[PDB]
């Protein structure tokens, strides 16, 4: 029904497919998803903004409806639905499948990383986790090691996939769950996060 | 000025009878068509159906003919009920004030026009996990601001929500006046099929002997909310 994607540099127009098959006139609505939000009615009836649409979202008159983004920015980023309707059925129960708008050349940004050991509240409970948080960055691809001293830590250790901030950049977190016996014994903890091409090391120790 | 706001168990047993409503405010139940819409995870949209005083509902054959959709006008509030609920129905809800408009493509008098609707305000959605699993309620713990955690006069405090389920897990700072400098990361899926979350907030340094730090967590699956005072050292 859509594309599945779409990538587009800074500043230049996005022109986003429908997913089409329409017999006759007609009415067509386009719905904006940003990473972690709800959808926005963007395009009505075509061509109809709602108040609050900035004019560089138009819409295609009246098969292959189009949505069209000028002057892209970092900010248009999401999944984009359209909704077909047309004079042939009474209701079109379908969404399209959507299109995922991807903004190029974003200027690059290493991750921050804040490594918590774990709480003496946690350890009085016979537990032991360490937090590893790493916020703004793009692009948003990262890999994650732990060490124990200078040893690789295979088990125990929860990374997530990275998610889009408000501010553009991405975000991820890395848990690595230990016993407190575990965590007395060696002289420090590592958390090693690489992105693109480059290691920022953040190490913590029982004191 | 209408708003809207999904409210489900957020955890459903298999073949269970799933229970959603949708609370409106700044305006009447009945003024206007109302819609659920559901989301997959990385997966798209689906309407669910829709219904209006009226007493006018209709449904997405895709679902199968177990979806009621009611209206409640002493409480202002939609209704949505979904029978025999499989893992296939776990997805984010939403509700969403909908409207038609009128398409003529010809003669009016041959009613050569078509109605078309369009969701133009929605709530932010509430998670429906189905799942054999029991709920379980998050432990707290504080993970204190320290020299380590901090850098140049900026440093970074927070709480940890460890292993709960299902989603969602809510979190806000000294109950909402502390909004900037918050960052509350999404959840890890643990192989435990736990989650995991981290709050953090960047604060003053100077700040830290003078100012008192709380983080609200709030599980509403298991009906418990958690304040944590998070101190230095």
């Known amino acids: 029904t859509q594309p599945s994607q779409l990538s587009v540099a800074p500043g230049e127009t996005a022109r986003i497919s429908c997913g089409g098959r329409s017999l006759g006139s007609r009415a067509v609505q386009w719905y904006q998803q940003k990473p972690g939000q709800a959808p926005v009615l963007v395009i009505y009836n075509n061509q109809d903004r709602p108040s609050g649409i900035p004019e560089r979202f138009s819409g295609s008159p009246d098969t292959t409806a189009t949505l069209t983004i000028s002057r892209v920015e970092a900010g248009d980023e999401a999944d984009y639905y359209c909704h077909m309707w047309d004079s042939r059925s009474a209701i079109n129960w379908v969404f399209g499948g959507g299109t995922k708008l991807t903004v190029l050349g974003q200027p690059k940004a290493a991750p921050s990383v804040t490594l918590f050991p774990p709480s003496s509240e946690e350890l009085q409970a016979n537990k032991a986790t360490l937090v590893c948080l790493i916020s703004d960055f793009y692009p948003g691809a990262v890999t994650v090691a732990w060490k124990a001293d200078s040893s690789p830590v295979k088990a125990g250790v929860e990374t997530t996939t990275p998610s889009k901030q408000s501010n553009n950049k991405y975000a991820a977190s890395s848990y690595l769950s230990l016993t407190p016996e575990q965590w007395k014994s060696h002289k420090s903890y590592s958390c090693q996060v690489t992105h693109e091409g480059s290691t920022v090391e953040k190490t913590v120790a029982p004191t | 000025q209408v708003q809207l706001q999904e409210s489900g168990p957020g955890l459903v047993k298999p073949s269970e009878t799933l229970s959603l409503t949708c609370s409106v405010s700044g305006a009447s139940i009945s003024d206007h068509y109302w819609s659920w819409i559901r989301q997959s995870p990385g997966k798209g949209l689906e309407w669910i159906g829709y219904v209006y005083d009226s007493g006018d509902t209709n449904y997405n054959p895709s679902l199968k003919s177990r979806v009621n959709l009611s209206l409640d006008t002493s409480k202002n509030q939609v209704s949505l009920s979904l029978t025999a609920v499989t893992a296939a129905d776990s997805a984010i809800y939403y509700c969403?004030?909908?409207?038609?408009?009128?398409?003529?493509?010809?003669?009016?008098?041959?009613?050569?026009?078509?109605?078309?609707?369009?969701?133009?305000?929605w709530g932010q959605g509430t998670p429906v996990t189905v799942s054999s699993a029991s709920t379980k309620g998050p432990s707290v713990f504080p993970l204190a601001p320290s020299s380590k955690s901090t850098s140049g006069g900026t440093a970074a405090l927070g709480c940890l929500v460890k292993d709960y389920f299902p989603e969602p897990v809510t979190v806000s700072w000294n109950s909402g006046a502390l909004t900037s400098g918050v960052h509350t990361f999404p959840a890890v899926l643990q192989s435990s099929g736990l989650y995991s979350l981290s709050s953090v907030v960047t604060v003053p340094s100077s700040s830290l002997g003078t100012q008192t730090y709380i983080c609200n967590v709030n599980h509403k699956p298991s009906n418990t909310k958690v304040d944590k005072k998070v101190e230095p050292k």
């Open positions: 969403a004030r909908t409207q038609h408009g009128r398409r003529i493509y010809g003669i009016v008098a041959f009613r050569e026009w078509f109605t078309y609707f369009y969701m133009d305000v």
